[model samples]
Target: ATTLNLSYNGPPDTDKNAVHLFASNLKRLVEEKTDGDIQLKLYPNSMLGEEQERMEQVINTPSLNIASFAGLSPIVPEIYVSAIPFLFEDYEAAHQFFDEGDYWNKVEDTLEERTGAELLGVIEEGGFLDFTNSKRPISSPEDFEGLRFRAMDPSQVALYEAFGASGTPIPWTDTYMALKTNVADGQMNPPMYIIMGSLYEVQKYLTLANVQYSDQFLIANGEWYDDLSEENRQAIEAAVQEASELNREDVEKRVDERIQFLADQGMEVIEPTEDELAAFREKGQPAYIEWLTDEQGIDRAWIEMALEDAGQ
Candidate 1:
């Protein structure tokens, strides 16, 4: 049996509606598609620890086998591509790049060679992130200035810092507590995450900057993956492709639902100007391009070419 440790950093309550539905779908696919050769053991709510701790633990422990990682940027630095504010033309463009193109495979190669994390394709959750806070609505770059925001990791620190906010690197699992205690005046999350993860309860406003796109990558250890039989390896590769498509569908569906849910719950939601989005994207692009060129050895030229092909 392929004993998988599927863990993530989010609100621990599996009973929560959105979390339950997502987990159920994934669990069903795993069992049925693998013909019961695979079994998923979910570790929700930092049960295996925070991003950094869980990352270290993954190298030595069996329970660290698989992770549905959100924005744990420092662990696998190349993931920043998922968050480049406006790099993607649209949702369809984003999925085409990752699923149908060589982009995700390039990322997967880098992780296995450099970080010991093997990519099983994208299991996205948090869509383009919307900034929120306990004070007035942040609908532009000018408003984000001076906001003390809790960032998910080092890369987020870079993104927010570029925007003139105090970007404090905080653990992904501890975000709610940080807000409850006023440790952070602002933070960004996708709509579904905002409602389902309870960020909506602590924050006062939501601005759909579509700023930071996120993916919940299903990853395994490089050594373990490399040692699998050829057929087993191919099985996972094929599964990753299918799983990634399903993940995108789920993300698109949930974003709309969560937006309505948050609105019904009385949170203010706003849209920013093109100039406002431009400011954030301007800085985000550099960080992303740097990582891609330096770490993944991929060029912006190719990504641009792909965008043209995808009509993004």
Candidate 2:
């Protein structure tokens, strides 16, 4: 039997994390289909290493890892286009784009050539980004004024600045304290992450903005995949498709429940009107596009392709 390692930086609870759910499903399907000819050893909670280290290991060795855009961006910076604000209008649009878009397929091809890592599929980390803040309910862009938000990275800082707010790039581990101690008045994440990280405890208001679709890449070492028998390769691809479907289903099914959980924990949930959300998109997307084109030097064609794929 050939033993392969699959690593992800998420809790082991399949019920809570879509990445783990996908990993567990992949492991079972691969093992069962291969009749134990292949064995997948699971490593959750970043037991292997941080995302960058694990991404590097996956490229250099015969292994698999679930990585966020941030983790993969160092290797293929073009992948950052996936995180463009409002790039995806909703789950259906996002799913269609990832499943059938020409740009996404090109991204996979580019990744294999650049890093020797094959893109297996995307794990829906959560549905989309929502804002949680201590100041007030963020129904529109003006609500963001005067609030200092904790940004996950510089791209996020650009988004906040576009909304007339300031942002500080803080580490994830420091987010809760940053909110509590007044270093930041707000932050953004999918409902799953807010619940998992217990951000509701510190933040008073939850706004379902659906700003950016959250996704994680399921990747495997290209050389290892290339060396597999034809039958084995087909089995792996089937497993990935099945696992990705489950991942999407799991995340979509839990959206309301996750939001309820946050409300039950004392958060005042706010759902913005369609017009209100449109205003945010109008303001934030252009600023991010400018940043991507001017500062990041990302080709405009990639952005155009994403828009076309999303039907925007």
Candidate 3:
């Protein structure tokens, strides 16, 4: 009954925030439901490093039992369209897929087969990434040309590749400074990050592109999960399901409030029209196919299935 070390990238205050409440809610359920036989020690912020780094570090590291993983694309590279821009009309669609659709089954099997991590459940981290820049509002894909946007490594590449936008992959931890110094011109994040990262002070424009939504996975080391007692497994497994359902509710609430929160921070928000969205997606479609199929080696049929099922 040693403690399981759990770490996430957000700040420590996040525990008090809605995001933290979700984490704490899960923590309490696991510990209490297990009769205190299981406890979680949370390392917030950069205590264990960035999200991607921490996930990779815990891959085979003994006793690093839990993590919040962002997306499957980075692990296998092609499954990202599952998180694709405009793939879902809203969180309701996401809920349908993750909560009870065949989509999750396909994605989960593919990921557990490839990465050492298993998706115990889906946790909502934030909404679709919006573009923030010192430049004017980006209403169409044409505006993105030659922009030195900051992005995370592979997932960010998938995003920008769709837009044909000029981008540099900046570590999430360094984005604020990069924007402050113009080392990287500007970047994108869910509103929580824009507020927490303090980017609104530096960036003037917020494009509500609704392009790609960000959801997270409650992941455990596959081997570690396998080694737990049947009772421990049942407790943790049920805990994961509860967290997943609860986290989705929390995400919906945050997204509803985050729009105003960004506006209050003095950032300009742009809501694009359907025609604008079509124009942007047109720019993205080729890159989506090119990188997803030719470069990443995903089964073209599976990729098509995700696109078809999501009605993209």
RMSDs, each prediction? 3.6, 1.9, 2.4
Encode model 1's per-residue lDDT on 1-312: one tens digit a residue: 877786665554543433444444556666676677766787776677766677666655543333533334555555555555576767777777676666556667767677776766555665777888986777656676788899766556766766677878776567888988999987877786676668878887988888655666666766676776776666666665665566667677677667777878888888667887776677566765565567555567655654454555
Q: lDDT of all the models against the reference?
A: 0.66, 0.86, 0.71
What does candidate 2 score on TM? 0.93
The positional error of residue 238 in candidate 1, measured at the CA in angstroms, is: 4.1
lDDT of 3 by residue, 42-98 (tens): 766657776667777666653342343332346755446575557788877777766
In model 1, where is the ten-residue run with the lowest total lDDT? 63-72
What ranking of all candidate models by TM-score puts the best one first?
A: 2, 3, 1
TM, every model: 0.82, 0.93, 0.90
Q: What overall lDDT, based on C-alpha atoms, would model 3 receive against the true structure?
A: 0.71
| RMSD versus native structure for model 2 | 1.9
Q: Look at candidate 2 and give me any clashing residue pairs.
A: none
* Ordered list by lDDT, greatest first: 2, 3, 1
TM-score of candidate 1 relative to the true fold: 0.82
Clashing pairs in 3: 85-211, 162-284
